[PDB]
Amino acid sequence: PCPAPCSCAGTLVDCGRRGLTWASLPTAFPVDTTELVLTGNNLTALPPGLLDALPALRTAHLGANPWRCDCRLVPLRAWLAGRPERAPYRDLRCVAPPALRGRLLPYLAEDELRAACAP
Numbered sequence: 001p002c003p004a005p006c007s008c009a010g011t012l013v014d015c016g017r018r019g020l021t022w023a024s025l026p027t028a029f030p031v032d033t034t035e036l037v038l039t040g041n042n043l044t045a046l047p048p049g050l051l052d053a054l055p056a057l058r059t060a061h062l063g064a065n066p067w068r069c070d071c072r073l074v075p076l077r078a079w080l081a082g083r084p085e086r087a088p089y090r091d092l093r094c095v096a097p098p099a100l101r102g103r104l105l106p107y108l109a110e111d112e113l114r115a116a117c118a119p
């Protein structure tokens with residue numbers, strides 16, 4: 001079942017470049033998905049569990065989103081930190097908050113993200 005905003009072929013789900021946000025992302029994706037394209041949306045973080053509910057995912061394309069590296073990014077960060085190679089994710093960059101702006105997502109630590117939600 002291909003989520004409404006996206007185009008699917010095989011086990012590729014193309015949801016790129018569609019103005020998606022956390023609020024508007026599909027709540028689930030075909031459980032057999034192996035490649036998910038989210039490049040070039042409006043995402044600042046990913047809902048908890050979205051990528052972990054995709055147990056066959058090989059690669060996710062996540063670049064060109066305005067990622068905010070705070071505590072809402074703890075789930076994406078965990079997923080990235082668990083990948084077998086982080087180099088394919090080196091185009092993922094934090095735009096905010098100022099203390100993490102310019103950092104690459106795959107090398108963030110969890111504690112940094114907790115700290116980035118300070119009052």
Ligand SMILES: *[C@@H]1O[C@H](CO)[C@@H](O)[C@H](O)[C@H]1NC(C)=O
Nearest residue numbers: 018019020021024041042043
């Ligand atoms: C996505 O962000 C762009 C760039 O700021 C904005 O113009 C556009 O309205 C947003 N699209 C949606 C669907 O929110």
Ligand SMILES: [Mg+2]
Nearest residue numbers: 021022043044
């Ligand atoms: Mg968002």
